[PDB]
Amino acid sequence: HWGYGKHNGPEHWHKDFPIAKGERQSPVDIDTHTAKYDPSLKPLSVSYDQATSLRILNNGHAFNVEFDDSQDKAVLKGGPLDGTYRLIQFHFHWGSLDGQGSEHTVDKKKYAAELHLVHWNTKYGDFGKAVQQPDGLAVLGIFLKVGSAKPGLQKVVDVLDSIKTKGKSADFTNFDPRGLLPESLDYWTYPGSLTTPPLLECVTWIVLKEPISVSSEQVLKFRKLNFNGEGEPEELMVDNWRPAQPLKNRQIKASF
Ligand SMILES: Cc1ccc(S(=O)(=O)NC(=O)Nc2ccc(S(N)(=O)=O)cc2)cc1
Ligand SMILES: Cc1ccc(S(=O)(=O)NC(=O)Nc2ccc(S(N)(=O)=O)cc2)cc1
Ligand SMILES: [Zn+2]
């Protein structure tokens, strides 16, 4: 029962997940003046036209929009990546207030939320094998700031009251994740980990520079979700983010 409380939050995780103190933990602060342009980076290719979303699940930590990943529909290629990575799910991390919520920071700036689109390397056959490899996953990170509404997000916001508590799910077909992307695909990249237990060091992070804007009313509905299950004391699902971890022996590269 790791979580985000004072009793089971990020400072406690290492007792059951010792890799929490590892050499390649995520997220990190992105120091823009230390990140270096890398002309070796190939163009980023986000091919989401044939995505098949399935369902939305409150897993007690966040909510995941899940995709059919039984073939190469929605894939991520290029950039720092070797080969093809299949979209399996996306989720967010967000704050109790607009001044915090993201996992990555940018010159110590916290955004209100962060979107994670999670992909696994098809050369390993399935997600479970992919998370045993140092290049098994690619996660596309996108910051959210509060301002104008994001039309592409409203369908997500409107289904949240049907998955308020842990373990609830709902059908969520025909959702196009292309409506959650910013205009620019300029990014930073570095080798890292999952940001929740099991904290496996298997991820190529690709963090877009340009945030998307969402409205106050949209993120307010995120904050009405619960960490708890039905019939249990209500604990609002807020501040489900891990803070920045030591960069150690890593270089963040800029595509721009
Ligand atoms: C009912 C059903 C089951 C399986 C599929 S599928 O096309 O094989 N897709 C699939 O398994 N997707 C999927 C599986 C696990 C996860 S998860 N649990 O890592 O969020 C996330 C996404 C499709 C429909
Ligand atoms: C060995 C193993 C594999 C998979 C799981 S799981 O719980 O089904 N999957 C899982 O945790 N997926 C996952 C976790 C964190 C992130 S994130 N936030 O780095 O984008 C993205 C995705 C648990 C244990
Ligand atoms: Zn995440």
In order of start, what are the domains of the chain with their CATH numbers? 1-256 (3.10.200.10)
Single-letter amino acid, residue 205: W
| Residues 59, 96: Cα–Cα separation, whole Å | 19
Return d(Cα 100, Cα 105) in angstroms, integer: 10
Residue of 23, 150, 165, 153 whose CA lies nearest to 90: 153
Annotation says 104 is catalytic: no
Give the 3-state DSSP-derived string for 28-75, with helices as H, strands as E and coil as C: CEECCCCCEECCCCCCEEEECCCCCEEEEEECCCCEEEEECCCCCCCE
Distances (CA, A) of 59 to 47, 163, 165, 231: 27, 10, 8, 16
Is the CB of 29 inside a 6 Å radius of any atom of ligand 1? no
Ligand 1 pocket, residue 64 CB under 6 Å: yes
CA dist., res. 5 & res. 112, Å (int): 19
Q: Does 105 sit in the ligand 1 pocket, CB within 6 Å? A: no
Residue 228 CA, distance from chain mean position: 21
- With a CB cutoff of 8 Å and minimum separation 6, the contacts of 5 are 235
Count of C-beta atoms within a 10 Å radius of residue 15: 10
The two structure tokens encoding residue 155:
């369908």
14 annotated to a ligand binding site: no
Total Cβ atoms within 10 A of residue 213:
15
Catalytic residue of the set 7, 61, 104, 119: 61
Does any ligand 1 atom lie closer than 6 A to the CB of residue 25? no
Cα(131) to centroid(ligand 2), Å: 8
Of residues 85, 71, 98, the one with CA closest to residue 140: 85
119 marked as binding residue = no
Lookup: tokens for 108: 């110590």
Q: How far is it, in rounded angstroms, from Cα 113 to Cα 103?
A: 8
Ligand 2 pocket: which of 57, 127, 194 to mutate (most atoms within 8 A of CB): 194
Specify whether the CB–CB gap between 109 and 85 falls below 8 A: no
Taking the C-alpha atoms of residue 23 and residue 193, their distance in angstroms, rounded to an integer, is: 10
Distance CA 115, CA 94 (A): 9
